[PDB]
Protein: HIV-2 unmyristoylated matrix protein
Organism: Human immunodeficiency virus type 2
Amino acid sequence: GARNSVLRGKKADELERIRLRPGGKKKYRLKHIVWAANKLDRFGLAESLLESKEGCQKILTVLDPMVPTGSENLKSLFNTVCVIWCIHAEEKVKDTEGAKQIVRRHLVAETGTAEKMPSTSRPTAPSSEKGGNY
């Protein structure tokens, strides 16, 4: 053994508790934490940011808008972070699907006012066009 870092003895329990899928019978394991920490360093993000809940917020915010506009390889790295942050924020989650709902919930709640947008006014796009004929 080499002590812990990302998850302590108590936190470890929560990890083995969370189920990989909503209708499955498998739970998360250390192996899954590694793949995530690695994908980060590689992509460009740190790995020690998975210890603190705050740091995880910076990883979920980036992968958030990338979820829809990101390959599957980016989807797995996101679903994992959502769980890690939940464990640290002290949020009870049955499965991944539940961990995400809780995460996004905390963002949307703020987005409601962050994206209040201006008054009623249609977008007046500028005039532009191309051409290439006789």
